[PDB]
Amino acid sequence: DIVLTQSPASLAVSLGQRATISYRASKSVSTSGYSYMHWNQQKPGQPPRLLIYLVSNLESGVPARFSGSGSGTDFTLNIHPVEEEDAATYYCQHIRELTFGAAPSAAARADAAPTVSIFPPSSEQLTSGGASVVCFLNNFYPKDINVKWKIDGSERQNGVLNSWTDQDSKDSTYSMSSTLTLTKDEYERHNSYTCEATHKTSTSPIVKSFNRNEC
């Protein structure tokens, strides 16, 4: 066995800045003086591309902004001026077995607070016996965000589903939907519903809340 340990799981990096992406082998992938490590782009919607073979050998038609170096266990991909074309995963694959590393993402802004909006279940959903309360948290940066749901003051963790858009191709922000699903019977036994968003742009979370029976 060989256990391929890539490191950051995601990097965000400004254009013209220098990314560096690590890889840690568990077992020394070096044979006869060579090292058999393999750096690999992958755009969403495309196959993987070979970038760098044998730890340091830049493949045909790969731009010289990419550079690989390391030895034994410890290897590094370097991207020197990053350009927007770089934005992709990057995995590090040994060629002694075939094990892959848990691929670093690499994203191309100024912090931006989410715009938060809360939506009670629609009347149409409440015919169903299920009830979903939706919070949209839109156009924020950075991606790290945490949502806590409360019902009548009590945190609810079960039944929460979060979905994130990919980083927007124009404005570089993220958006998220957080949906609390409960039974209709439970929904109508409570009045206050709250989604709280913790994000680095505020010292305390943004709170959106409604009382079910108010207008």
Binding site: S32, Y34, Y36, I95, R96, E97
Partner: protein, 80 residues
């Protein structure tokens, strides 16, 4: 030795200074160890080329070359 291929299979061009030493080369399926027991001389025009079979827990018989993980072709000269 120079490691190349012959129809997808690994091929070893063995020179004179390797006579008597274990031949090791990495392969997807782990490390391969071929054993050369050959008239092995200097690399020249008079080459001979043949296959070193895979041998798992079997004693060798009527052969002077064999590997233990992946069958390999071998080539060496007989000059001196």
């Amino acid at each position: 030795f120079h490691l190349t291929t012959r129809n997808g299979e690994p091929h070893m061009i063995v020179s004179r200074q390797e006579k008597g030493k274990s031949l090791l080369f990495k392969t997807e399926d782990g490390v391969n160890m071929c054993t050369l027991m050959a008239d092995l001389g200097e690399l020249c025009e008079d080459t001979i080329t043949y296959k070193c079979p895979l041998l798992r827990q079997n004693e060798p018989e009527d052969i002077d070359c064999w590997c233990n993980s992946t069958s390999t072709w071998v080539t060496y000269g007989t000059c001196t």
